């Protein structure tokens, strides 16, 4: 667009006087400048691409996979071939018990594994509260969502509003 700009700048000074319209104007230094200043910027891009060539939203899923990966590493191989599915059910059960404001204490669970599940539930809790409030500002603002996002959001906000309401009742007591 800029070179066309310079053409309009140059031609309308060039084509004054006895010079009329026509293909005879060549004052090429302006456009040639512009294309060299483009070459300045994309020289290291194409050089980095040739050096690479001529060589030699879902935080709950990532967080659950990361804590499952962290739990598994410190398990022995003779015990993790039975135990791993069960600790995923323990993760999901602690998260279901957090979402329900009910006590989750497994007595047979060892307290470092229990502390890591507690940690996972706190990280997912903070993400879950934040994504419920963020998706609610999205929905309430008028941003375009589908049915399962609203349904999911309404379930998250119902559990959050009842956590706040149970805290309100216990503050009254």
């Amino acid at each position: 667009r800029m070179c066309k700009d310079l053409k309009h700048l140059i031609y309308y000074r060039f084509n004054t006087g006895p010079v009329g319209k026509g293909p005879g104007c060549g004052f090429w230094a302006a456009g040639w400048r512009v294309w060299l200043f483009f070459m300045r910027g994309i020289t290291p891009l194409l050089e980095r691409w040739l050096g690479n060539l001529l060589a030699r939203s879902h935080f709950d899923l990532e967080l659950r996979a990361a804590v499952m990966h962290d739990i598994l590493d410190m398990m022995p191989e003779g015990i993790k071939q039975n135990k791993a599915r069960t600790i995923l059910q323990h993760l999901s059960e602690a998260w279901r018990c957090w979402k329900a404001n009910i006590p989750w204490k497994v007595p047979g669970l060892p307290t470092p594994i229990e502390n890591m599940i507690l940690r996972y539930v706190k990280a997912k809790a903070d993400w879950w509260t934040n994504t419920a409030h963020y998706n609610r500002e999205r929905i309430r603002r008028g941003a375009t969502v589908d049915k399962t996002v609203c349904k999911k959001n309404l379930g998250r906000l119902t559990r959050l509003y009842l956590k706040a309401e149970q805290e309100r009742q216990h503050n009254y007591l």
Partner: protein
């Protein structure tokens, strides 16, 4: 139109496609004021001249 744009200027002071050309809606210098449309080009003592023009 220009009296309309003058009182509009008052009334608002207080109250995919590759397009290779600039639009005429991108334009400025659509003035109402005759001191700013016809803007008395420099007579450089009648001896200096604008660049490029013949």
């Amino acid at each position: 139109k220009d009296k309309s744009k003058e009182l509009h200027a008052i009334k608002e002071r207080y109250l995919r496609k590759f397009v290779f050309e600039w639009d005429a809606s991108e334009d400025t210098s659509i003035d109402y004021n005759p001191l700013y449309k016809e803007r008395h080009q420099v007579q450089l003592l009648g001896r200096g001249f604008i660049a490029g023009i013949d």
